[model samples]
Target chain A: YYSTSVAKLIEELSKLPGIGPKTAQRLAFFIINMPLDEVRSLSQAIIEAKEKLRYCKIGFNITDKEVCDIGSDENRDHSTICVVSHPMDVVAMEKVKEYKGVYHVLHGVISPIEGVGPEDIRIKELLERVRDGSVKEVILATNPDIEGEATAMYIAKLLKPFGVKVTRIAHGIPVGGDLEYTDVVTLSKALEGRREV
Target chain B: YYSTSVAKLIEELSKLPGIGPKTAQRLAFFIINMPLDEVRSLSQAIIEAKEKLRYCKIGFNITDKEVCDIGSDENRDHSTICVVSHPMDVVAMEKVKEYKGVYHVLHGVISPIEGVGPEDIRIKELLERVRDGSVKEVILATNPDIEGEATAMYIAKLLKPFGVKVTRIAHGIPVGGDLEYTDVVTLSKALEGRRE
Candidate 1:
């Protein structure tokens, strides 16, 4: 609660990255007054820790786990998959309780014609999982822009012969967005309903 | 090495005094990366440990004992007392590695012309210690002028026939001092002695 020596603490702690003046203020209060033994111990811990991450073998997603948490869960729908373009997005999709399936991470989108294609990402892993016949559906949860659309379409087309039902996530003007700033394409897409409400 | 989102960790650690942005990043990385096991151990130690900071009873210096190390030691000279104005001055004296005798702290000076006098300081305890026959010499290691001289005179007068010698610390140009700020009194004293 007190930061009497916090300015000095902040002064020294501010030398690291992503930490700001206001952020440094919080850590300094705990540092200067902690008993000397813990101060020394804490410093030792900071330097000696060295951990490197590897991608989960099954999902090709960056995880400290042998298999990503979602993939390891027996309760999850092994026949269903929500494919995302990034590991961070795994967390974003996790916020929706309705997603009972596991994930397949494609580290990049289909940026073809500029040299990136289906082979550049984790698409091969996605295809292998579908070929195993355990995956019944693949939800294309990529970005909503040009790159995302092309990638999802190409993925759907790739999965067509494998007999797996493929689908893309919905796109529209966001709930809180200003209608004025939304593009014409988004307006046309949202014009589907003229209800009695 | 940190987790997916480092929101609360940043809020908690930045409260410590010396952690900075750079060190925080390194520490946060290690702390976050540390097997969840070690962080739990650190959390345990934080609740249990403490510092041993009891004060030395005799000299009032902060220590972890009933009596100060110096007062209890047999190797030190107990006959001579070097009186000082503050405890930190004892450190300066100790740094010289030249003063062998033990010390007494006055904690304040005697300015008798005003209402302030020896009674206001540690003089009574000092006199009681000196009254014991084995005392031989008392060094006035207090600061240079008015208060030092008056305190020295007061102790010297009280020791009139007690057979102990009273002396003031020397005065002159400091060994490494610049002549630019040398006061005339110090300059003259340095000039008083003509060496071969």
Candidate 2:
């Protein structure tokens, strides 16, 4: 218990995804001997980011204020909304800033293995937003994974009764690839495939 | 930043060795959604272990108190000391409890590339401890790597003027093979080669 701080840091580091006890110990020792200012800066960054950011009320993406930059922008097309499964996806989409339509973040797709169903996700919120009749078209921009497709299909079926256009994003991007890594050409093609949705 | 707790946990986990952002996110999500009692138990275990354990003042191995279990035990021979480069090595050495000697942990070996030198290790403390005339033999139990070899040679030279016996653990253990993986035969051979 003499070096509780060091031990705690090592234990916390070990709990991380791929760090083993040895690596954790090594990292703990490294950090202990690291420059105080560097350590302080890293810690400050983490605390600041956590404290300042919040989910946008409208789109569910990360934002510093009540509304996301994309959702609140008057220039964005209110008629079309691209639905994604996570905040990171919004960052990816932001890279294609030419996209005039706003976004809706679902926070997650369906994963039965993990006991994540439609109700577990932001499906209810999405449904409410779509049923308001303000959005003329809904784009299913979930990942191309099995869980992502299943989620998109379930939502598309649910939106069928609403009389609003619902379409899946085109498979212009590589199969098994994330939108985060998709090049501008593929992203543009996927956006071009947007018809009524 | 959305789901701040999840994001924070993911970021923290990502800083660990081998954990990428994706894996960190997955782990963070798993931990966050876990039952409260389970999370509490894990946290309690971490806090308790950290609060109860201390480094052995003598050998640098972990102990419940300042004195290591081996170091303070009267039955253990103080005349012979096996020198290792890590506390984990003490656990490995413990499997052969019949050895009946003390241990000294250097915590790290000499690695010039990693900027680790003899001065950076616990060699000074070890030398001082042996100079008391209580220890007649010093066994170098460093790993069979180039750095380990260099460290052992350096330490052996330092102990030479004192006229005490100094030797290295046998190369009987295969190069790159961990002590935990070596068979009883190899372990015995390594022990048999120890300087009395």
Candidate 3:
């Protein structure tokens, strides 16, 4: 069936993550009147990103070239690598600024129910990187959920023979959170893992 | 200044009514990824509207040529003309379907506070249209606010001397409204203007 170009634009926009039919229609109308150069540039940028950007060879995070900025940086500590499940986590860790190490993106964590196992992720590559004597301390900075914990434990056991220090990022009550509002799990974890600075 | 194309797109998107800066940025990103042919068609449509869509010679509403579809249609009753303030009102009136007359789009209402007067609107054109001796009734379908009422009254008095029937649309408790919960103004208007 033949739909108007405006209607087709709205249909395509509605397929995006958060856009609804109303929002898609509104956006379609708004862009329909936009300048030619502006629309061309916008479309070109999307096409370029889709065409050029791919997973980095060293880490699984998205990059324009073969290697990502973090993985290729000579100043980054190769001996210490922070492992994360997704590319967005690398962006989050970059904001910390104090982390001198590089990153190894696993692309995903272990989830048995979802049918994802050790082979589904980059665990083999991570083990190879450690066994080859390139990495000394592997920081498992995956989320503090059951799957993240399981993945970290599995990796830690795998690297036990390699003689590398495997550590999990601390999980407790947030810095600005009030004691009265803190959950029992968080309060208990904070008390048990109390450290002197 | 030399802004990135993404930034330029965001700036233009933000100028749209009701779109915020964050929404503009998000829309820009989304549009950037849209198919090339679709984007081209959208740009072409905008250019076409700007170049081809001209104001109707008789009414203030937009039309493809010199005259609007309503004004030129031979079947429509030219004697009874519904006067509205904008082109969108023509679309709203079309939904009624029972109104068998032509339209006179005023383009804007009289707003003395904003320094707008009857002369600033399409009042002169409307008077000229009525003077042509084809119209006998004028229906005022403007909003029920201060400016709308004043505009309607001024037009009504202006067309009274021409021996044309002038009437304003009813303003009372709207459909699906409960009488017990309606405000004093609506309830009073409904009680006084009730018709079977």
Top-scoring candidate (lDDT):
3
Give a tens-digit lDDT track for model 2, residues A60-153: 8889999887778888797888788887666655553445687888878799899988888888888888887488888776765667778889
Candidates' TM-scores?
0.39, 0.42, 0.48
Chain A alone, TM-score for each of the models? 0.71, 0.74, 0.91
Residue B82 lDDT (model 3): 73
Per-residue lDDT over B1-196 for candidate 1, one digit per residue giving the tens place of the 0 to 100 score: 4554574566567777897666666787778789998998997776644355544555545456787676788888877777766766666556545546777765577876666687777777777777764777676655545675467667766766677766544433332232233344443433221110
**Docking quality (DockQ) for each candidate:** 0.00, 0.01, 0.01
TM-score of chain B of 2: 0.78
Candidate 1 all-Cα RMSD: 37.4
Clashing pairs in 2: A1-B53
Q: Candidate 3 on A132-183: residue-level lDDT in tens?
A: 8567788776665678768878888898887777776555433223334434
Q: In TM-score terms, which candidate is top?
A: 3
lDDT of 3 by residue, B121-183 (tens): 788788888778667777776665577667888777776686667766654433322323334
Which structure is stronger by TM-score: 2 or 3? 3
